[PDB]
Amino acid sequence: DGVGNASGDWHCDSTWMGDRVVTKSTRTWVLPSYNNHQYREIKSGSVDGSNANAYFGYSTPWGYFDFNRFHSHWSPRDWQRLINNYWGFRPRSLRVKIFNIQVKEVTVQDSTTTIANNLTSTVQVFTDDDYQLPYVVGNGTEGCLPAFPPQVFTLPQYGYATLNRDNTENPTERSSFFCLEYFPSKMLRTGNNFEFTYNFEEVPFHSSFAPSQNLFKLANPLVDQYLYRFVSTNNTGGVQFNKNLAGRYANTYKNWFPGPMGRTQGWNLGSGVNRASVSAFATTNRMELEGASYQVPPQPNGMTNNLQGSNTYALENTMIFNSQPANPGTTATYLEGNMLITSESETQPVNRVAYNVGGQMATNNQSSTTAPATGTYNLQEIVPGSVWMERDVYLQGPIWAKIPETGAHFHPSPAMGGFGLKHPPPMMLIKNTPVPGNITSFSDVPVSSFITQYSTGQVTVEMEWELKKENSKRWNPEIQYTNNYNDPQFVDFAPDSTGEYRTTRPIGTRYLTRPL
Amino acid sequence: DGVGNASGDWHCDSTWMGDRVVTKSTRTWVLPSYNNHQYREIKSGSVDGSNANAYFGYSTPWGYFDFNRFHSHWSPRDWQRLINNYWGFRPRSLRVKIFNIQVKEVTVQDSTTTIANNLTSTVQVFTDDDYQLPYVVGNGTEGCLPAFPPQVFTLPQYGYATLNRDNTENPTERSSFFCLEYFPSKMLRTGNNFEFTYNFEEVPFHSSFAPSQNLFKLANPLVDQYLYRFVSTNNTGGVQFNKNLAGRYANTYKNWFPGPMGRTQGWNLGSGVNRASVSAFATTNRMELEGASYQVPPQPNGMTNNLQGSNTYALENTMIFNSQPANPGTTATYLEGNMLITSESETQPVNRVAYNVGGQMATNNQSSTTAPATGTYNLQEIVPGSVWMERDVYLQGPIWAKIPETGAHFHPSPAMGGFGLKHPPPMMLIKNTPVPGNITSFSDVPVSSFITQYSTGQVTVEMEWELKKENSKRWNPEIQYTNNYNDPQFVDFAPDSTGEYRTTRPIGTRYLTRPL
Amino acid sequence: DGVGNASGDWHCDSTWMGDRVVTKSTRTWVLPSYNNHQYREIKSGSVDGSNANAYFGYSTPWGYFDFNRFHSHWSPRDWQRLINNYWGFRPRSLRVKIFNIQVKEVTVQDSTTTIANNLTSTVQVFTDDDYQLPYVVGNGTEGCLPAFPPQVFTLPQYGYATLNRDNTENPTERSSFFCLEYFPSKMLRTGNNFEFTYNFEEVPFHSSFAPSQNLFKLANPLVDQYLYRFVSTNNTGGVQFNKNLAGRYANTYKNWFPGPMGRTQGWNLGSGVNRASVSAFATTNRMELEGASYQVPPQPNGMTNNLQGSNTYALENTMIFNSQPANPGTTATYLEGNMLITSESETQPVNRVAYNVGGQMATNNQSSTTAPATGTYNLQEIVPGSVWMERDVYLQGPIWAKIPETGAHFHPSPAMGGFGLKHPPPMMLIKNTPVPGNITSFSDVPVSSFITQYSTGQVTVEMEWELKKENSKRWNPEIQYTNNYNDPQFVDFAPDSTGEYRTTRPIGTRYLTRPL
């Protein structure tokens, strides 16, 4: 209620309750006064020789809350207890609560930066629950809540890129500008707090199970099919047929088919017999959209890199995390030992691999003169009767994404993994209100001299997850995420002597196994 | 009730009522006695050198009502008030009402064509609401209600093409014949009327908004992704990775993908550097269906001609209306100045252009010997995680179409734009009953001499439209359909000194703008 | 209630509710301690060679709130949605609310200006709702709420000019002095707020429609009048008459007449064939009032500059805004490219142009000796049966004005446009209470050493607007305010890379069209 009273407590826990788990998480944040309290016009042309990077947009002084990663809510033990016990999970509700606001004021006088707090300065928070702003949350950007609870994170500055003109930095007449002070926002002093509740829409469970059985090997290898296959022609043009035998899965009749494919390049990790000195930009899979051509990693769902125990990965198809957060705007050439190169090997009985051709189809009509000929294709889209698996979600990866408000779409599983939401959690924007400096006269030009200041405080996020319980009559034990290190020099998913949070490997969800 | 009393009034109006608009429209029609009151066998072989044009079918004396265009219900001002204020619209109900029937009888005696009315002759009207007839309404044919209310239109003759045999004019044993006098029809004198009500099924709203934001540019250009991309290999085969920077949309990880594509040829309008003297038939995109090969304009949804401000259009992908209705069976070579060549430039942030390749995929497996190679594809079908925009509807274009009664289908947006209906508005068939001439003796052969006669009357159509209200926090003004002509020599969407209804340009729906 | 609690939230929105729109707007203000807390005697003589500029008056330490411009309440999109959809609008209620007061105290010690806040200092606010003060709000002065919500504005100092004597700086015995601490004012600490409600009186709607039809062309051009005109005399003095034909509007009988006129000088913008090197002061239209002569722009209602598509404007008749707010007291010679020269071309079917003579009247009595002669007049006042159009209101222009408390008036449309109010919104005056410095002894002279200090805070203004709905049976589309720029280098009505709010063109209201 006032300055000498706590406006909320530290809730950071998890409570497994049957087929349901709430996951609370309080973090501490810092909000810089971005742009010195003004809207700016960020724009760029073709950098790196590509006019795909040309954008037009606006950068606001508003910061925002991005709790759209799984480690922001899940400890690695509560993640381990999830992915080794349950076949699925999906979010149900959400409860965000910003509290203990305190706003300092830096006063650099003769290089003595005194930092004191003003009790009177406010903080604006609104939530965009009519979805009228550019939703920039679900795009794999930084500025998230940290994985580790005693880390203090700075809130990312809110910008958005509108329509540019002809792949330049210049706008078009459809390019918009959203003023964010034209939205009603709650003014928060140091004794006020901002609560917010949200209920997720009906989404499918994330299929956190690996297949126990190949897709083209769903018949039993004991009894044989009552269907025959064309095998050959005789010395005349008379066709000949053979019975599909029992375990001959290469030529049985299939009833279901794998998912989409676009053949990406496969690069060897580990030892590697890769091509030396490849500038890997000019040969990636691009998807040209209204002018320029864009790299689109990862490719849409229905494929996999990395078959099984092979060091060949499709690096265009994968999600490559770093081990630690990096400095912004770095041009460092990281190697294999720095990254978390993340495999989708668990879905190979259903999905086709991305560094191999998917099949072959007949190219000509045969005759007594022309022999039959086939040709391999590098990409195949949705066929009726297809079945694929969605992208695996990770502890270090995004939870949701917003479906773009277009006319139509085909089934909206995000390519980066997670939950495709039509009405996602609304984007909580926040800024410091501008406090003017010493203004002694009237002028019609607006104030450009402000008290330089930042605010800080805590935020708690309480999600709730409906879980799909495992129910299998499998006899032998399964593979599960065990803590298996040979001679650990450090405890993983735990700090070090420096005090930085050390993660080494990404953690999937498909560890339970389930027959098709 | 009788001959001296009006059997219905002229309702032609529109009543905007919140998120709902009823649009009434009365027109005056003329019904010729088609075929001289008999069923005939229309059939043809390969004309224009193509056996696709070979059909077998039947032509009835029945005429029909085709109010399946948007200008039959919408004035251009009420269309302007729709497409500049609302994000969507869909039909809800329908009410057709045929009234003031009067049937003349032409009597050419010594070249003095006296036209008098017989009070006793009837008119048959039935509606086909069990969908047992070939539904020929939603196919882009003429004979519609006019755009302009005081125009009198003639009702189109009802024919249908059944199954022919082996791309000839001869029938197969599956070819059917539907007698239309085997359906119960209401006999209408000059004092009778025919009412009919219809409620549309649950359809999606037509997305009458343009995107404010590119599909591959949905991240913000301020914070950068926590995902890395394979960039290159070193002097060994060791892979190397770089962080996806903030605004580098050409190589970020994408979550949603564009729609289908088939690469069509792009032709330059305006000035034009087109290839001179092209017979443009042999190089169009065809789709061979059970024998012959058919041109299929427009190609299915998910593409666009005409990027932005460029004079290159994909003429195979577009809807080309004329400015005025034309005489039937004309072989005139119209030019650019006659037609209404209709752009889909508003959907280019989501759809791929039809005169460019959509992307490229890896063609080989790399090694220390073989370098990586990619290959461009000209067509890509549905991939899971796709999102496209539907075809824009126009003031001069069709409202609905019937889904064919087959087994299965994929999401039934008609390629010509509009609303894919499973149970469309039933086809109102109408004919003049045959009045025999002077028959003085009995003969078992049926009567072939009739009183030559036509009927005329009014028809009113009352549709009802549920509207999706615009709700955006966009700050700057939008583009809207304004009446912008530089030195008009005539008022557009209004008559001239001749009295003919002059339209110059087609009117879309996507003028409001909305972020993905 | 206290220092650690927010005393009000940021309301800044608009809610269109049928034929009604509320427009909330919160801004942040800075209040300097004007005059160092004392009343002063501002007076001047003849500057610029004109004794019209000689005034006597008083300058107070009070600042005031001036939300009397349309952009203080309306975003340009909500202004666009108004002027393209409605035929009229007028204010109904008002709700001002000053909150989050915080008062700093600047302490310059050895050129180290430390700015800290005192929790104990107060702020006086009263509202003048008996109209006992000189109302200086509705006069086109600066110090308004900004157009753009995150701009912080400084409150203008309240002064007023009373009666001087004989066009000098000396007062007369009727010259008054209003002490503003003789009015009861609410003392506001940092935990207090000041609410205020107001209901506007019955005013006419602002006619935000252009005429679709000329005033002298209201007959139809098909049938002719039953009234004859004197055309000529014969070889004798016998009069002769002709019938007024159908479309001959130059000599039909008129029933209604245009508004007032005073011929101003017309100057060419754009290319321009203007007279070179004109000191444009000595030839303007003046209106001499009790001694001196005053320029009176704009001239009273009933005229227009700028016919249609011509570059000749009457610059004495127009409202010339700047693109950006300017520094106070500037003597800069702005050009055409800086200003927002604002046209009244939309009202030319009803109003007469200001750079042309309005008509001619007979100067002599004719005879057999003297021929008839006419003479053009340069000004014509109200004639019974007149009809004119009021001044267009703009997004950048004033909302209301106070009618002077005189005896009588003729219909009080303000010449600067807007709503003539008899009891306007009361003028919210505000000052910082004086906190004395170090006073160690008693003296009967009042304290002149104070703690130098300023206060800041937020103010929200909630107006409510009754709207006149458009209802026209016009067929063709209208002209509307579209966002039409050819190659934009910047988004208009939105910031730039500097962060300043960029407006280029003024926005009217007459875009709908309506017949007389």
Residue numbers in the entry:
A (entry chain A), B (entry chain A), C (entry chain A): 209 to 724
Would you copy out the relevant sentences from the publication that reported this structure?
Adeno-associated viruses (AAVs) belong to the Dependoparvovirus genus within the Parvoviridae family. Because of the broad differences in their tissue tropism and transduction efficiency and the absence of pathology, AAVs are the promising vehicles for therapeutic gene delivery. Adeno-associated virus receptor (AAVR), which is a glycosylated protein containing five polycystic kidney disease (PKD) repeat domains in its extracellular portion, was recently identified as a key proteinaceous receptor for multiple AAV serotypes to employ the post-attachment events of viral entry. To dissect the divergent rules of engagements between multiple AAV serotypes with AAVR, we select two AAV serotypes, AAV1 and AAV5, and solve the atomic structures of their complexes with AAVR by cryo-EM.
In contrast, PKD1 contacts the outer rim of the spike on the AAV5 capsid outwards the icosahedral threefold axis, which is on the opposite side of AAVR PKD2 bound to AAV1/AAV2, and spans the canyon region towards the icosahedral fivefold axis and the twofold/fivefold wall of the capsid. The AAVR PKD1 polypeptide spanning residues from AAVRV305 to AAVRE401 was built into the density and refined. Each PKD1 molecule mainly contacts one AAV5 capsomer (named capsomer A) but makes one additional contact with an adjacent AAV5 capsomer (named capsomer B). The PKD1 residues in strands F/G and the CD loop interact with the AAV5 capsomers to form a major fulcrum. However, the structures of AAV5 capsomers with and without PKD1 attached display strict structural homology with an r.m.s.d of 0.27 Å for all Cɑ atoms from 519 residues, indicating that no obvious structural shift occurs upon AAVR binding. As a control, the wild-type (wt) AAVR bound to AAV5 with a KD value of 0.287 μM.
